[PDB]
Ligand binder design. Sequence first.
Ligand SMILES: [Cl-]
Ligand SMILES: [Cl-]
Ligand SMILES: [Cl-]
Ligand SMILES: [Cl-]
Ligand SMILES: [Cl-]
Ligand SMILES: [Cl-]
Ligand SMILES: [Cl-]
Ligand SMILES: [Cl-]
Ligand SMILES: [Cl-]
Ligand SMILES: [Cl-]
Ligand SMILES: [Cl-]
Ligand SMILES: [Cl-]
Ligand SMILES: [Cl-]
Ligand SMILES: [Cl-]
Ligand SMILES: [Cl-]
Ligand SMILES: [Cl-]
Ligand SMILES: [Cl-]
Ligand SMILES: [Cl-]
Ligand SMILES: [Cl-]
Ligand SMILES: [Cl-]
Ligand SMILES: [Cl-]
Ligand SMILES: [Cl-]
Ligand SMILES: [Cl-]
Ligand SMILES: [Cl-]
Ligand SMILES: [Fe+3]
Ligand SMILES: [Fe+3]
Ligand SMILES: [Fe+3]
Ligand SMILES: [Fe+3]
Ligand SMILES: [Fe+3]
Ligand SMILES: [Fe+3]
Ligand SMILES: [Fe+3]
Ligand SMILES: [Fe+3]
Ligand SMILES: [Fe+3]
Ligand SMILES: [Fe+3]
Ligand SMILES: [Fe+3]
Ligand SMILES: [Fe+3]
Ligand SMILES: [Fe+3]
Ligand SMILES: [Fe+3]
Ligand SMILES: [Fe+3]
Ligand SMILES: [Fe+3]
Ligand SMILES: [Fe+3]
Ligand SMILES: [Fe+3]
Ligand SMILES: [Fe+3]
Ligand SMILES: [Fe+3]
Ligand SMILES: [Fe+3]
Ligand SMILES: [Fe+3]
Ligand SMILES: [Fe+3]
Ligand SMILES: [Fe+3]
Ligand SMILES: [Fe+3]
Ligand SMILES: [Fe+3]
Ligand SMILES: [Fe+3]
Ligand SMILES: [Fe+3]
Ligand SMILES: [Fe+3]
Ligand SMILES: [Fe+3]
Ligand SMILES: [Fe+3]
Ligand SMILES: [Fe+3]
Ligand SMILES: [Fe+3]
Ligand SMILES: [Fe+3]
Ligand SMILES: [Fe+3]
Ligand SMILES: [Fe+3]
Ligand SMILES: [Fe+3]
Ligand SMILES: [Fe+3]
Ligand SMILES: [Fe+3]
Ligand SMILES: [Fe+3]
Ligand SMILES: [Fe+3]
Ligand SMILES: [Fe+3]
Ligand SMILES: [Fe+3]
Ligand SMILES: [Fe+3]
Ligand SMILES: [Fe+3]
Ligand SMILES: [Fe+3]
Ligand SMILES: [Fe+3]
Ligand SMILES: [Fe+3]
Ligand SMILES: [Mg+2]
Ligand SMILES: [Mg+2]
Ligand SMILES: [Mg+2]
Ligand SMILES: [Mg+2]
Ligand SMILES: [Mg+2]
Ligand SMILES: [Mg+2]
Lengths: 171, 171, 171, 171, 171, 171
Amino acid sequence: MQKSNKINDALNQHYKLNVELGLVYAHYAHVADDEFDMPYLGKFIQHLSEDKLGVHKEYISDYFKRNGMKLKTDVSVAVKSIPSDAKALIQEVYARENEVRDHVKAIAKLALAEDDYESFYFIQWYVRDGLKDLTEVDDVVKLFNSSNDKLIIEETIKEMVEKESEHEIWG
Amino acid sequence: MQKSNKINDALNQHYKLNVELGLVYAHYAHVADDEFDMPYLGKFIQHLSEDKLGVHKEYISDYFKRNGMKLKTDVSVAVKSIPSDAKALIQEVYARENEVRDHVKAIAKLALAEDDYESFYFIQWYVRDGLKDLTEVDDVVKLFNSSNDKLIIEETIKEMVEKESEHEIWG
Amino acid sequence: MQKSNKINDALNQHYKLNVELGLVYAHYAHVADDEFDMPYLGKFIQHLSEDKLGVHKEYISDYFKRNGMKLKTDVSVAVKSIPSDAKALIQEVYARENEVRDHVKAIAKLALAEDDYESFYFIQWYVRDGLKDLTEVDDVVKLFNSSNDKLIIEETIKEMVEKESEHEIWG
Amino acid sequence: MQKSNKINDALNQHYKLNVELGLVYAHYAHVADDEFDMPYLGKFIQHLSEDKLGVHKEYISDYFKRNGMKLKTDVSVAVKSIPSDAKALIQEVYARENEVRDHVKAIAKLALAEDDYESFYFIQWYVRDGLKDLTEVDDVVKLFNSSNDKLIIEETIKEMVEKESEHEIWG
Amino acid sequence: MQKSNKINDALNQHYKLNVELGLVYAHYAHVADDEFDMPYLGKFIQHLSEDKLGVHKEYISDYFKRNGMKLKTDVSVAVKSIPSDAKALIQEVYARENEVRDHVKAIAKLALAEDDYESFYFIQWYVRDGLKDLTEVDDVVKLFNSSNDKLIIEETIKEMVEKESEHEIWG
Amino acid sequence: MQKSNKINDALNQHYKLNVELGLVYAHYAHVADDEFDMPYLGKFIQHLSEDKLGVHKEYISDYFKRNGMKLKTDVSVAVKSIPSDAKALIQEVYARENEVRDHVKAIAKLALAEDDYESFYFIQWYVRDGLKDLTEVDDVVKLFNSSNDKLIIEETIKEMVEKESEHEIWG
Ligand SMILES: [Cl-]
Ligand SMILES: [Cl-]
Ligand SMILES: [Cl-]
Ligand SMILES: [Cl-]
Ligand SMILES: [Cl-]
Ligand SMILES: [Cl-]
Ligand SMILES: [Cl-]
Ligand SMILES: [Cl-]
Ligand SMILES: [Cl-]
Ligand SMILES: [Cl-]
Ligand SMILES: [Cl-]
Ligand SMILES: [Cl-]
Ligand SMILES: [Cl-]
Ligand SMILES: [Cl-]
Ligand SMILES: [Cl-]
Ligand SMILES: [Cl-]
Ligand SMILES: [Cl-]
Ligand SMILES: [Cl-]
Ligand SMILES: [Cl-]
Ligand SMILES: [Cl-]
Ligand SMILES: [Cl-]
Ligand SMILES: [Cl-]
Ligand SMILES: [Cl-]
Ligand SMILES: [Cl-]
Ligand SMILES: [Fe+3]
Ligand SMILES: [Fe+3]
Ligand SMILES: [Fe+3]
Ligand SMILES: [Fe+3]
Ligand SMILES: [Fe+3]
Ligand SMILES: [Fe+3]
Ligand SMILES: [Fe+3]
Ligand SMILES: [Fe+3]
Ligand SMILES: [Fe+3]
Ligand SMILES: [Fe+3]
Ligand SMILES: [Fe+3]
Ligand SMILES: [Fe+3]
Ligand SMILES: [Fe+3]
Ligand SMILES: [Fe+3]
Ligand SMILES: [Fe+3]
Ligand SMILES: [Fe+3]
Ligand SMILES: [Fe+3]
Ligand SMILES: [Fe+3]
Ligand SMILES: [Fe+3]
Ligand SMILES: [Fe+3]
Ligand SMILES: [Fe+3]
Ligand SMILES: [Fe+3]
Ligand SMILES: [Fe+3]
Ligand SMILES: [Fe+3]
Ligand SMILES: [Fe+3]
Ligand SMILES: [Fe+3]
Ligand SMILES: [Fe+3]
Ligand SMILES: [Fe+3]
Ligand SMILES: [Fe+3]
Ligand SMILES: [Fe+3]
Ligand SMILES: [Fe+3]
Ligand SMILES: [Fe+3]
Ligand SMILES: [Fe+3]
Ligand SMILES: [Fe+3]
Ligand SMILES: [Fe+3]
Ligand SMILES: [Fe+3]
Ligand SMILES: [Fe+3]
Ligand SMILES: [Fe+3]
Ligand SMILES: [Fe+3]
Ligand SMILES: [Fe+3]
Ligand SMILES: [Fe+3]
Ligand SMILES: [Fe+3]
Ligand SMILES: [Fe+3]
Ligand SMILES: [Fe+3]
Ligand SMILES: [Fe+3]
Ligand SMILES: [Fe+3]
Ligand SMILES: [Fe+3]
Ligand SMILES: [Fe+3]
Ligand SMILES: [Mg+2]
Ligand SMILES: [Mg+2]
Ligand SMILES: [Mg+2]
Ligand SMILES: [Mg+2]
Ligand SMILES: [Mg+2]
Ligand SMILES: [Mg+2]
């Protein structure tokens, strides 16, 4: 039952991605509120930031504890430009979440190629969450095409953030 | 992350199958009660009808919303003969549920061949449910071989329909 | 007390109409959400779909059980074009509900012509519901002429769908 | 939908392994308490014994009921030597749980090779549980390297056994 | 107060008998449900299986802890034929429980011959339980001579299994 | 009321320090559990990690929103060596917290030199917390000099982490 080095490498990279994404989202949350005057968009993006810096990274470190894989912490990220408006801000968040689905798909494929069924089981959470997170971000992108009034958009985001739930399949 | 057309095709076909099955089961439920004098068999088959026309089809339409796949509605079904008695009615329901397991297996195999891990995750619900639904139908088929008294069979179905649960694995 | 064949025919046709309408509405609900970015319009139309595929058809099958009429299941429906925008989507729903009132009126007239007072009683539910359903759809059509902001319309539909009631006359 | 004989064989073997493991663990639990004066270690190992002789074997027999596979009961186990001390006792439990992960991995691989997606679904429980059980045993092995005082180790095991929970992923 | 070797031998043999009986009953429970279509008979026999593999064996191991007797685990059992129908299945369970009473009687006689009054006290539980268990099995055997309808028998077993009790004498 | 650039610079640097510290502590928490077999030390260090990545950084971003200061995200941290044992791990945490007090003192001094009384008020939280956090870490360092038994130390940390409070002055 020796751990896969390739999976170890791919999951360390995914740990890194979730840390750096979380740090960028925290900046984007500040910017949505501070410069675009959209505090509820900020809260939406802040929750996603805390999601990436929270369970997304912690489940990997916990997995590594269980199977002998080695954790690496190697983090480099700088927010050097900002999208020009709130719509492009959330569209960028959408693009990054779409890349998450792509990275996660590669890990699922690699786990089967390695006959690492514990890792294929483990990554199912991330397969499900890749689509759930994208859907939630997509629900906010839509609003900027449905109204030209920032305060109307903000009121619709407020409900989304303040909604209490889980889809049977997508969580 | 472009959606698979083959999976899109297979899931549209499975949507269609669940609609048409649900419509046939609704007819069979009427017939069990009206012509075979087995109202609890009717209720059992009606619940299955509502299961197929409900979450079985709605989960597919919801999935399509999330990933860009296209929904098609193309439905053609006619109930042109009826099984001759209640035993053969439920045996036909059993045969159709067995085909469901077969169709679902093909989709699972196709998702792996396409490296579509979101679709392989999605279909696990249907893999589990294929066997759960078959088991529930099988539990009713058994009764017709265990007693020659319709009212005794009906009393045993009543309990089954009125039972409040979920197996850890099969749901 | 022999059952009317003409009423049997007209009610089988109305069963068919409610099945096929329900299937079209389920498609329209998907489209409202997925392509027009109006999830609450989708939920409104989904509820109507489940109404047609639910009590509207089940009351007919139950009636047939009581009086010897024969149920037929013969269903053919394909959604081959979509209205171009959300306003035209609900306007189409409105047009189909208006045809429902017309079909139901014919059955009421036929029941009196046949001196089938049980069927005239039975159809009163559908006479009342024809106008109630049209009124509910009409309440949504109005919104697209009252605002050019999709998110404002969506917020008004949300309240309608989330409202807890029954008019003394129209139910 | 004919059942796989190879999977049937592999799951009968896994049934056997869980029975025989459970019987050995019951002996080890007696020994931990009776000869090593570690009643809480005994209770920890007894719970694992009841886990193997309980759901681990019963889920297989239940699965076989659902799909036509044949159950075999063929059990041969004799506890002919005992590890020399409590540390080596739990280390042996650890080694056997590590072999469980290996046997379970083979079944997962075989289910995919057989395109037996119901069996691949079924075995996911055992894939998850292979790592959870190993982790729990590993948590006890650690204690013998962290203290040379048996009563201190016993107090830490007591808390573990008396703890009321489930990881989102590993259960 | 040196422990009796003969009693030690007889109680190790009785431990073995309860393990092997429990394993056979678990197979019989599967068969009652799976092949004879009698799930409540299966549950009845499963409870007996868990009774033998539970307190019946655990009380012996606990006794051995208290008095210096040595536990042996030496288990060999294979289910190589099945009774032909449900009636003969429970009749076989009855025959094995009757042998339990006989084995237990020998231990009681041996304890008095050895002036081992702690062991005579200990075995009183098994003397009482030998007759209680036989009575419970006998109550099920009776049903197959009282009705030729499997579903009627199943309904009577359901009540027995779902009954909440203890006789002042026989427990 | 123009914002101080020097304070803006010093608080951006302190934001960076709290991010990078939080990431290092998350690694140290993994290591305490995984390699040093001290899960409660791990939880202690994980809580500190979440403290630094949480309110410590978020209060700064919130302050910047209120006064026109500019947030910068520029993060570079790599965990390239690990302390050799648990005692040196917490001693390193202690050294880093001591540097926090030093950095915070510089900001307080700078705010007075700039007559930036809003920033002097703001930083009082960090002045208080610098000493509270150090005290909490110091309470754990002490344990490694008070016992040579890892499990005894772990039990004392457990209480600390599971304690429900606030000093009137130090919080
Ligand atoms: Cl840079
Ligand atoms: Cl903007
Ligand atoms: Cl994109
Ligand atoms: Cl690969
Ligand atoms: Cl036809
Ligand atoms: Cl019949
Ligand atoms: Cl079949
Ligand atoms: Cl394929
Ligand atoms: Cl067509
Ligand atoms: Cl539109
Ligand atoms: Cl019209
Ligand atoms: Cl007319
Ligand atoms: Cl041997
Ligand atoms: Cl020892
Ligand atoms: Cl090992
Ligand atoms: Cl294989
Ligand atoms: Cl043999
Ligand atoms: Cl039988
Ligand atoms: Cl006998
Ligand atoms: Cl004797
Ligand atoms: Cl470096
Ligand atoms: Cl250490
Ligand atoms: Cl220092
Ligand atoms: Cl200064
Ligand atoms: Fe604000
Ligand atoms: Fe969330
Ligand atoms: Fe723009
Ligand atoms: Fe997430
Ligand atoms: Fe509002
Ligand atoms: Fe409002
Ligand atoms: Fe509101
Ligand atoms: Fe509100
Ligand atoms: Fe009825
Ligand atoms: Fe159900
Ligand atoms: Fe027949
Ligand atoms: Fe189902
Ligand atoms: Fe009854
Ligand atoms: Fe009864
Ligand atoms: Fe009853
Ligand atoms: Fe009842
Ligand atoms: Fe939605
Ligand atoms: Fe309504
Ligand atoms: Fe238009
Ligand atoms: Fe209606
Ligand atoms: Fe409003
Ligand atoms: Fe509102
Ligand atoms: Fe409101
Ligand atoms: Fe409201
Ligand atoms: Fe004890
Ligand atoms: Fe457990
Ligand atoms: Fe040793
Ligand atoms: Fe387990
Ligand atoms: Fe202590
Ligand atoms: Fe204690
Ligand atoms: Fe305690
Ligand atoms: Fe306690
Ligand atoms: Fe069953
Ligand atoms: Fe009992
Ligand atoms: Fe016989
Ligand atoms: Fe007993
Ligand atoms: Fe009865
Ligand atoms: Fe009854
Ligand atoms: Fe009853
Ligand atoms: Fe009852
Ligand atoms: Fe742990
Ligand atoms: Fe704290
Ligand atoms: Fe040292
Ligand atoms: Fe702090
Ligand atoms: Fe304590
Ligand atoms: Fe203590
Ligand atoms: Fe305590
Ligand atoms: Fe305590
Ligand atoms: Mg392969
Ligand atoms: Mg491949
Ligand atoms: Mg007239
Ligand atoms: Mg293949
Ligand atoms: Mg004498
Ligand atoms: Mg001055």
